[PDB]
């Protein structure tokens, strides 16, 4: 099924994923498409942080859902 990843950097990325795909897999697809290293990626659905080891089905992420991507760039 298709899902969308709306980046804070302004891109909408379309992905082909299955319910059994892990958040780890999804970040790998984003590296494939966008070149962003997975360890930099934070993924969010409906205001909730997604964890690498969990599946899309765990979060009830359905077809044509939108995820959000933020980068880890904290500095002091």
């Amino acid at each position: 099924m298709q899902i969308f990843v709306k980046t804070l950097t302004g891109k909408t990325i379309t992905l082909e994923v299955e319910p059994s795909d892990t958040i780890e897999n999804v970040k790998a697809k984003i590296q494939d498409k966008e070149g962003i290293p997975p360890d930099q990626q934070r993924l969010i659905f409906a205001g909730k942080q997604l964890e690498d080891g969990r599946t899309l089905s765990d979060y009830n992420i359905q077809k044509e859902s939108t995820l959000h991507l933020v980068l880890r760039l904290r500095g002091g």
Partner: protein
Amino acid sequence: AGYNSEDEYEAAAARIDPATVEQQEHWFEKALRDKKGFIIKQMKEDGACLFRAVADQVYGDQDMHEVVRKHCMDYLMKNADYFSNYVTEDFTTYINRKRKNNCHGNHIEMQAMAEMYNRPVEVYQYSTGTSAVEPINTFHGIHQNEDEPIRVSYHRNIHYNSVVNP
């Protein structure tokens, strides 16, 4: 705990050699002069460093960090409908924190400042793998900028300085 960016705090504490750093910084600075004619300007390493660098870029001095932080947080509040979908905390709770002068800036704040000043924010970062020094990211709004990009540099993955075009 429960901070939007909680997942960065520990990995930052683990990472963290004064000599190896010191050497990388000579090389970063050299490649920056040599290829872009940019200079690195040292911002105080308190919690305000991101806003110090922006303040240096925008107002010419890092002592304007409190004004920048304040404006950035007001802007984020006024654009909460957009930015709150990227924050996993209650939005007002997030911004309350981030208003504090020792709270470290992050991606959310850099994006807001790019739009708010109508100036792209270029982030520079040393790589041991190349001597290239193209920005790692350029954040921007949709409006046509009349002023030069705001340029910051990201050191040890934990600190921000000012990148000057002299």
